[PDB]
Amino acid sequence: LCLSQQFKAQGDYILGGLFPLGSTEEATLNQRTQPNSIPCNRFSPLGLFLAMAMKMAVEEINNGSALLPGLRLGYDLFDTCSEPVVTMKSSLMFLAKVGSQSIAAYCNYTQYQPRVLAVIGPHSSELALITGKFFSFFLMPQVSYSASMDRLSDRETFPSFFRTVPSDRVQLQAVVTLLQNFSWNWVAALGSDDDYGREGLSIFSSLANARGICIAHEGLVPQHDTSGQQLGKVLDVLRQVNQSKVQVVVLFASARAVYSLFSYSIHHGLSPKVWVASESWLTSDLVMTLPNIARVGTVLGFLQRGALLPEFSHYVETHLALAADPAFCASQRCPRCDDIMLQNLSSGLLQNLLHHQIFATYAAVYSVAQALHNTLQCNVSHCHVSEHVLPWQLLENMYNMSFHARDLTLQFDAEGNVDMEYDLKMWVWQSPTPVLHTVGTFNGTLQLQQSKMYWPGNQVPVSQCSRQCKDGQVRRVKGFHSCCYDCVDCKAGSYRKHPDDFTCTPCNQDQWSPEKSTACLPRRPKFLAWGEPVVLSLLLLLCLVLGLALAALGLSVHHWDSPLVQASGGSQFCFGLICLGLFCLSVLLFPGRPSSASCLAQQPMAHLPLTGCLSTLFLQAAETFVESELPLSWANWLCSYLRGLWAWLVVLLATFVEAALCAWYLIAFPPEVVTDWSVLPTEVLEHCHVRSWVSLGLVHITNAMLAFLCFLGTFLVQSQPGRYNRARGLTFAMLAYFITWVSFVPLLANVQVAYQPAVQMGAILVCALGILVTFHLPKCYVLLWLPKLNTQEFFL
Amino acid sequence: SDFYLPGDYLLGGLFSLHAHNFLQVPMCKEYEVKVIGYNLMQAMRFAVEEINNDSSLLPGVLLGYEIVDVCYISNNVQPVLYFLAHEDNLLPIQEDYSNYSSRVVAVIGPDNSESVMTVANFLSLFLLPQITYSAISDELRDKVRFPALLRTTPSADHHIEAMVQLMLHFRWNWIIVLVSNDTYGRDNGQLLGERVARRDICIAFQETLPTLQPNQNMTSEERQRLVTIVDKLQQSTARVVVVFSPDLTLYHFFNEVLRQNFTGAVWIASESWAIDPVLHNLTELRHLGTFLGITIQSVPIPGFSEFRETCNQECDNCLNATLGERVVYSVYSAVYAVAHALHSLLGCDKSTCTKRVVYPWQLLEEIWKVNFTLLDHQIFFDPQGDVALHLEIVQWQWDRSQNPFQSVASYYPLQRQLKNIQDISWHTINNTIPMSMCSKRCQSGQKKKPVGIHVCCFECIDCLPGTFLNHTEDEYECQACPNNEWSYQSETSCFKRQLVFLEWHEAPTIAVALLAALGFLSTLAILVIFWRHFQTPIVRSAGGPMCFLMLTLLLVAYMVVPVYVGPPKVSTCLCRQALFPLCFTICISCIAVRSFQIVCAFKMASRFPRAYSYWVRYQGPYVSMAFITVLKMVIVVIGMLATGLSPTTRTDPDDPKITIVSCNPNYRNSLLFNTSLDLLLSVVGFSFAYMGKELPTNYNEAKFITLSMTFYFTSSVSLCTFMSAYSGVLVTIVDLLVTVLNLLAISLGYFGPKCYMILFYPERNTPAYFNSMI
């Protein structure tokens, strides 16, 4: 077909054009050492579509009367080959003096006469930079349809560069507004390693920092998938996103880098994330090929709302059909186009989404034509043809204007951009292929249609960060900038001493602190002080039991001449009752502030009087036993021998053994007054510490053995009626003793620590009360209410 | 003017001697003069004149040049068109330039990286060789992208490596980065980011400085911006601060830092401001900290000190404005490189030169090739286009007897490491290296616990008992102790635990064994003395096979001590947990049924003769003994199968060395279960005998049942009391002691009185005495 021949047409004024028509294979891309020409040997449909769009625009402009009446606007095109060398060699021919093959190095622009009025610019940002810097010296206006990078905005270096697409800064302002709307204050930011991604990160980070959005991590993903280094790099990026606990990610990248990242992201199993895409890859004909996409998570991104051109596909097919006729040849820039048939340019390729860039090319041609229309001061159907315009004259008319595309109006702003507007489009996964849903629009502010949003589940996802700690918390900064904190609570036993933004301070030994505390509080000392409401009952019981003891003693002294008392043990009985009264009073060593004296004294001071008392009941049990269970022929001798001085001998011997064991306890296992700062939550414990409770048996074994021997001496005995039964009283007394001190151990082992002394006091009191109630009380009861029995015959 | 000299071959030269309505393009002269441009231009002129004087380098050939005062970004393009022209002003456009001959054969290119890339893209299609002297941008290494370009300087790669190796040498682990908004700052900050994490250093934070300028007044928002940055500096624990910025902008930043009363940092200065006089002269900087700077090493040109003292090729104020050592050698070596490459291209030897027309691409092909020694330094181009020149680190000094900047290290790019570091006079109290690290190092036996994102952030936590720290294996989790070892919490190693069990060396153990032996031999004597009097009424009424087998069982039960004592074995553990209790229990059950028979059986016979008629018919007492025995069998086995046949290990309550080996680890639980039934039998027999207290039918049996069961009951209650308040080693030996004491309770308290009557009251053996009870 004759395509390549259709890339030129004469006119009174001529427009230049650079398009990605051609390309060269990878084998060509070696380092270059000799100044030969590049072998352009491939074809693309995108370049031909854009060239056809320009051809359509100029054809329409020449058909109508609304622009440039009475003049024929011409055009001819070159291919960039996506190659700077070819691009420069091509663009030089725009500037070369018309009708000749050379360019002259005049020192300023006014001396040149270029052969084109304006240049419809290249596709990619790299060539946009390269050619804009070059053209600026000649002040020839250039209108790129695709180059969105923001560095091109600078009027100082690019005074003659214009474009019909928004700059990246507007898109990223939209993205920042989106993050700001959902309060997504904590995000990761990722860009591709090429200049587009690095500049994208530079723009987005500035905007986010300015609006207080905190970037958890910022980094670049590689463009290549060839070696283990790249796999490790993407694994490290995934690690960064995972450890930072991000949920929203901004990915401003070119498509191949995103494909490389996503393919490995699917593999490595990272949880779904919210990805804010970019127009540079949200088109995603490539990305749709992945084996899984639903596990990636939600994808959102702003997409341009340029106008549609229904006529364009019919135009393309019409001209392709015309280019089959050989008659035109009776009347290269790209040789490879001639090999292409209509089946290679199917309508399915035009239905790719490319409408944005096609319409941008159309609008670019209309912008140049309208600028010339203003420059020629046209009346309706009449130009001011008195002059021939040079480009630097058109430039001054280009800035202030407004121009109309097909049913749309535009203006070049103060720095050569256009004020276009956006759709917020999101992917939903229910269909076999992902469906783009419009869910909002941006025109300088975000007009979200929030009710239509198909989140996973039915609620907004979030990642956020705490901007300020509560007063009782310790800070710790995080983020790429130190823009935000995470909070530490002061655990009990620590306090917020300073704004030391890493760790809390432990509490002092003399003090305590609760949760969330700013400062500590001293801990009070604790012990069984006098007047404690439970100890008060013991202090009453002490008086009650001592009162019983003293009442019995007084009654015995009152009736001292009567048989009952001598039969009960006479002076031994009285002495034992006095010893029991003294035993009760040992309670008073325990309460109050502990001391080194009482801590050591308390146990002997308790058990010695009790030993003295119990010896007499043991002797009465011996009397009962010798009176009932031993042969008379030496029972009488023992009975008459043990009574009297030898009873005092037994008393002294028991006291001496008890005292010796008390000394052995005071040397081998002595207790101590211990202060504990840890065993209580808000207090300091003061208590008499015992090394181990099994060591306490030294002062017990004597009394326990005496009690057991008494019980064995009394339990089996029985007596005639009409006589006093000592056995019942002694039996109940020893039984009560054993019940008391069997209860003593498990209670002492299990009461809360601070109350332990109360158990010992209570044990002593209850033991003495039992002995009194069983052995003495019935005797005094009979003495008071029925003295008639008080006789030698009844009691002896 | 001096901007041009003729010759057989010409070099282009672009130097920034200086710095719109956009149609009003300004002339380069309309901006302030910059002295470094004069220095560099005079360096090129000196090099070319010297090469013309050296008859051995270009014999019979004169080098010329055309120099243009490019104003640092603006007014590009015009110089390259001026250079590329074929004749006068004209440049032809064509497909192939392999036969072309431009006005100049090589270009000594601009300084600013933006301008270098701008010029390189235009020269590339001709492959006219360009050499540049100060553009450190790392992107210039892409010779697919910039085939025509070479450099007489190391790139930003080696500067960043100098910084990183400085940090490694002094072990700075935790740094701050500040960058300008320029491409310079952002590029170098990302490159530092790529080098740092790779080697274990961590950046605390990075932030962009505002693009202030020193002459104008500062706006309120810019003021607050600087305040906000300095606040983050003052709050952080890091103190190494790396600054990638042009020099002119930092004056405001350091004025603010001074105003904020900041101090104590180490400032590492990049190439762009490491040697700035203006910043150095800021009077009060010396209080802030230590200033270190990476810069290319100075090489003195011998003759230069004397030599220095239609448009865009003229100047009016250069010298009087003057009235750069570290870059002059780069300019000098670039010119000498072109000269040597030309000498090779002409195939020349002393006085044999043939004066070809030379095409630039061949001169490039030769410029890749030169290798020679210049001024006692050897220069050749790496395939990536860089000449290897040394870098150095300079500390700023405010003593003006010496030079303002003092060298303290040198970096060799070919050996690629920093060498012969000298004394750096720090700001600290005694010149101790100023440390900055995120965290303190672990103490012995402490694990790490990561915090946040960065590797340097971690807590230190002690290992728990049963675990230990092994630096050879890990530090982020503890290693477990072997099953026979333990650890003292925070420790680097384990220690061996010790097993404990009863053995005969111990005083209480041998004492208990001797007590059991006394019981055994007394029981055997009782048995034999009963057998010797099988005919007596005593043995007829309270003897026979029941007592014979009771005594046999009891004396074999006395053999418990060799089974309790000594290292445990499974069969002996089963024996302890079932067999000894089992054979001991039935004897107590016999005492119980005898306590029934003595009194309660008669109560049954009188009150409930039907039940008594059944009881005598179905062998009541023997069946009862068997019944309770099988109940005991169930009770023992259901505990043993729930706790295991083998011996078990338990921890000592407060001694870490000891592990206690014993049967029945759920002691208290089984203790209660086993005694519950035995002590209920004890109580029922005890109460029955108490009811028939004085019954003398069986030779006053009730009294002795009472005594024996009293001993058993009190010993059992004492054991249950003791077990509520103790948990140590003595548990099992006290268990054994109580077992032996119960064996004694039975063997002596029940049988002994009968034997005492047999031995020492023999008249009671007569049937006459027995019949007195009837």
Numbering used by the authors:
A (entry chain B): 23 to 353, 367 to 388, 393 to 835
B (entry chain A): 25 to 43, 50, 52 to 340, 358 to 371, 381 to 831
Publication excerpt:
Sugars and other sweet-tasting compounds are detected by the sweet taste receptor, a member of the class C GPCR family. To address this gap, here we present cryo-electron microscopy (cryo-EM) structures of the sweet receptor in the inactive, unliganded state, as well as in the activated, sucralose- and advantame-bound states. Unlike other class C GPCRs, such as mGluR, CaSR and GABAB receptors, where agonists stabilize inter-subunit VFT interactions to promote activation, the sweet receptor is activated by the rearrangement of a TAS1R2 VFT loop, which destabilizes interactions between the lower VFT lobes and the VFT–CRD interfaces.
We first determined the structure of the human/mouse sweet receptor in the absence of sweeteners. The extracellular domains tilt toward or away from the membrane, with an angular range of up to 11°. While the orientation between extracellular and transmembrane domains can vary, each domain remains nearly identical across individual classes. To improve the resolution, we combined all particles to generate a global reconstruction at 3.1 Å resolution, then performed local refinement focused on the VFT/CRD region or the 7TM domain, obtaining final resolutions of 2.9 Å and 3.6 Å, respectively. In the unliganded (apo) state, TAS1R2 and TAS1R3 show a highly asymmetric architecture, and their extracellular domains are markedly tilted relative to the membrane plane. These features differ from other heteromeric class C GPCRs, such as GABAB receptor and heteromeric mGluRs, which adopt an orientation perpendicular to the membrane plane. In our apo sweet receptor structure, the two subunits pack closely against each other at both the upper and lower lobes of the VFT domains, as well as at the 7TM domains. The tight packing of the sweet receptor is facilitated by interactions between VFT domains and CRDs, with the VFT LB2s held together by loops extending from the CRDs.
